[PDB]
Amino acid sequence: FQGMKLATLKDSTRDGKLVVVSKDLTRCSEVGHIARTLQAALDDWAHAGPRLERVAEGIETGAQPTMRFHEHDAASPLPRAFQWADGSAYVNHVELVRKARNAEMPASFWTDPLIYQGGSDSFLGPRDPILMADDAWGIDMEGEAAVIVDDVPMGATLDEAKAAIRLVMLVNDVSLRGLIPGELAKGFGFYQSKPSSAFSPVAVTPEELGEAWDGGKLHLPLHVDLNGEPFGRANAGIDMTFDFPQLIVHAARTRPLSAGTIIGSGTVSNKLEGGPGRPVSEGGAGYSCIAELRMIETIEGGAPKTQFLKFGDVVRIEMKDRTGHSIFGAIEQKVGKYER
Amino acid sequence: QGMKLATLKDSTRDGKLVVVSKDLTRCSEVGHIARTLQAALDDWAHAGPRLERVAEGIETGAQPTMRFHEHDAASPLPRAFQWADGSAYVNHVELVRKARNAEMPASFWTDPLIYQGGSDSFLGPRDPILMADDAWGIDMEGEAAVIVDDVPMGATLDEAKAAIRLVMLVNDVSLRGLIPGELAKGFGFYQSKPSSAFSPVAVTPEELGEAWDGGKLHLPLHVDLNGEPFGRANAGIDMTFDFPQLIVHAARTRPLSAGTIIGSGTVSNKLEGGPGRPVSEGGAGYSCIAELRMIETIEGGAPKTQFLKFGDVVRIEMKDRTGHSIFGAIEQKVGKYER
Numbered sequence: 001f002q003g004m005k006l007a008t009l010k011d012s013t014r015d016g017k018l019v020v021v022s023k024d025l026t027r028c029s030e031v032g033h034i035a036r037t038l039q040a041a042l043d044d045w046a047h048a049g050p051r052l053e054r055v056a057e058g059i060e061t062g063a064q065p066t067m068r069f070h071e072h073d074a075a076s077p078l079p080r081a082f083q084w085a086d087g088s089a090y091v092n093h094v095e096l097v098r099k100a101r102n103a104e105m106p107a108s109f110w111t112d113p114l115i116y117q118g119g120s121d122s123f124l125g126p127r128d129p130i131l132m133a134d135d136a137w138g139i140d141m142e143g144e145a146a147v148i149v150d151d152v153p154m155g156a157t158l159d160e161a162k163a164a165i166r167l168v169m170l171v172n173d174v175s176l177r178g179l180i181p182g183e184l185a186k187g188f189g190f191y192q193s194k195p196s197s198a199f200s201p202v203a204v205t206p207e208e209l210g211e212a213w214d215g216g217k218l219h220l221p222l223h224v225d226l227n228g229e230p231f232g233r234a235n236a237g238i239d240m241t242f243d244f245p246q247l248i249v250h251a252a253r254t255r256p257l258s259a260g261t262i263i264g265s266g267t268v269s270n271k272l273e274g275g276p277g278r279p280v281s282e283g284g285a286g287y288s289c290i291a292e293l294r295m296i297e298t299i300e301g302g303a304p305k306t307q308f309l310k311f312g313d314v315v316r317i318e319m320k321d322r323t324g325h326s327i328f329g330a331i332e333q334k335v336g337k338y339e340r
Numbered sequence: 341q342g343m344k345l346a347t348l349k350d351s352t353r354d355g356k357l358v359v360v361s362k363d364l365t366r367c368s369e370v371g372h373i374a375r376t377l378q379a380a381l382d383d384w385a386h387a388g389p390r391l392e393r394v395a396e397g398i399e400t401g402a403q404p405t406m407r408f409h410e411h412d413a414a415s416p417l418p419r420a421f422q423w424a425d426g427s428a429y430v431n432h433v434e435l436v437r438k439a440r441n442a443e444m445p446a447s448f449w450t451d452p453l454i455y456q457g458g459s460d461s462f463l464g465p466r467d468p469i470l471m472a473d474d475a476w477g478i479d480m481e482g483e484a485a486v487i488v489d490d491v492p493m494g495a496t497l498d499e500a501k502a503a504i505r506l507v508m509l510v511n512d513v514s515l516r517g518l519i520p521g522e523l524a525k526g527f528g529f530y531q532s533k534p535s536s537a538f539s540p541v542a543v544t545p546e547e548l549g550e551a552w553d554g555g556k557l558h559l560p561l562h563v564d565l566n567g568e569p570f571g572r573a574n575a576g577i578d579m580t581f582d583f584p585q586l587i588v589h590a591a592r593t594r595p596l597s598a599g600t601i602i603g604s605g606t607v608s609n610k611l612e613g614g615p616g617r618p619v620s621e622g623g624a625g626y627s628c629i630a631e632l633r634m635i636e637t638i639e640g641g642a643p644k645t646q647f648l649k650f651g652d653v654v655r656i657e658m659k660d661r662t663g664h665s666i667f668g669a670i671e672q673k674v675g676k677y678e679r
């Protein structure tokens with residue numbers, strides 16, 4: 001027996017309720033005698049992990065009592081986290097955005113990973129609406145993968161970083177494109193322009209991924225849908241200039257990463273014949289965000305065309321295994337106005 | 341009447357919450373109320389008043405106590421769900437721009453800077469600042485911070501001020517050597533901003549008395565370098581953005597959950613316009629070496645004062661009108677990290 005899936009169910013507490021989820025995402029089991037929350041399990045993984053694995057095995061064989069798992073009831077696996085740090089591993093994407101400003105990208109960007117520190121304390125659940133005051137802010141989804149690490153020492157090596165990867169999940173790094181230029185122009189990175197993100201209903205162990213996980217990257221299309229229509233099928237194993245251990249090593253240069261740290265891959269992006277990717281409806285692999293499409297329209301046609309997310313739109317993100325079954329469950333979110 | 345809270349280091353990640361006497365000599369575990377500061381903040385509307393009764397008992401002698409050792413204290417939140425650090429003393433920003441020779445857009449006087457910081461691995465007040473290389477421009481940064489209860493997205497100044505729960509000092513450890521290179525990448529600070537440290541004790545606004553005016557702390561911030569007065573800059577002067585303003589800015593497009601830490605940015609004072617002078621010369625000095633080097637470069641050509649090297653010792657504390665330490669002392673020796 002190999003692999004397991006974990007989820008956090010919304011409840012009256014801030015950290016929610018940890019459950020072990022069946023491979024098919026239909027059944028789950030509370031595990032309060034081992035750990036009440038995912039963070040607690042991570043805090044003591046060396047001991048809690050093996051015990052959760054036995055529960056996972058028991059769910060598979062039916063020896064373990066279960067209830068129904070409802071993605072609509074899931075929080076993000078860590079509803080609040082101690083760290084959210086997001087890379088830009090598909091350096092093609094940042095090349096496109098840099099090139100749209102009609103500027104050249106330093107060679108250094110192929111060798112030196114980007115990362116930003118994100119808000120970690122108020123993540124949206126996979127099915128919660130993206131609520132915002134104003135959709136003139138260039139609301140955009142950003143489909144990525146993330147790993148959750150155990151403790152990582154300051155100055156960690158690649159072997160250390162690899163070995164510290166405990167869970168994988170999908171992410172929607174919600175962005176406000178209209179606010180980005182002026183904010184970064186302040187010089188202090190992202191804050192207002194990067195609101196609360198959302199993660200998939202389930203996080204899985206590397207073992208669960210099977211051959212789709214090479215120890216440092218995922219080798220599967222990331223399905224991003226917009227209003228029911230395929231928007232991106234970009235392969236997470238293609239054009240990824242920096243893998244997860246590389247991002248982790250980068251992150252740990254001058255600081256430890258405590259257990260529960262979430263590292264984002266950055267928006268998944270694919271080139272086509274060495275050129276900008278083309279849309280799915282044209283045979284291309286599409287895009288994991290609307291920003292990348294607009295950049296390409298800007299380069300191609302001198303300016304953006306396709307509009308960002310407006311109230312009422314729906315975005316879906318999920319990853320399917322070789323046989324077509326969902327691995328992490330689905331992020332599916334309706335954009336709507338925040339009621340104050 | 342006010343109170344002081346601390347977290348003692350123990351075998352767990354979140355440490356042991358204690359209530360601390362006003363004189364910082366005694367303290368008491370409060371496990372029947374909350375094991376951790378976070379847990380108290382999570383349920384503050386109920387836990388807060390219970391903790392206040394304990395503080396009151398410590399004061400009268402009714403509550404059994406033990407000795408408080410600042411050396412055994414973690415940061416009050418050893419790990420936090422959020423750390424966001426402003427630069428509310430825009431004077432400092434203007435000086436960094438000046439040493440480069442760019443005018444500052446007048447918008448920096450009405451638009452707060454803020455950045456997302458590492459929150460998961462804070463050093464304790466007396467823990468050493470360990471770095472692999474002291475040629476990275478290791479610098480201290482004295483500031484004040486506030487811990488907030490839940491703040492809704494798009495919160496107002498009134499809600500902002502009402503959400504302030506605790507006040508503490510901070511050393512925002514900075515690697516100046518890496519800052520230029522990192523920021524040029526365009527994604528803000530990460531590698532150049534290592535783990536920070538907070539004061540041994542966090543205190544309620546009420547404890548601060550008049551020195552707190554609801555948005556601002558009005559006392560000198562003591563920064564020492566190897567036992568010498570380096571900064572005595574007043575935290576209520578030249579503070580162009582108050583804490584509520586910092587909070588409202590942070591909350592524009594996101595809620596802030598209970599336990600969110602908001603830093604004011606390095607405390608800096610103008611003399612009468614233009615740069616402050618080094619304490620030894622009658623002025624209020626500085627709360628970071630960087631500010632000093634900017635002043636040296638601007639008037640003179642190039643930095644003359646080195647940053648922190650191994651063996652250097654920094655102290656950061658704040659004393660009330662009567663000269664008693666309010667928060668306890670951050671005191672750290674810079675040292676070589678090795679694996």
Ligand SMILES: [Ca+2]
Nearest residue numbers: 086173266267
């Ligand atoms: Ca991103």
Ligand SMILES: [Ca+2]
Nearest residue numbers: 481512605606
């Ligand atoms: Ca700072």
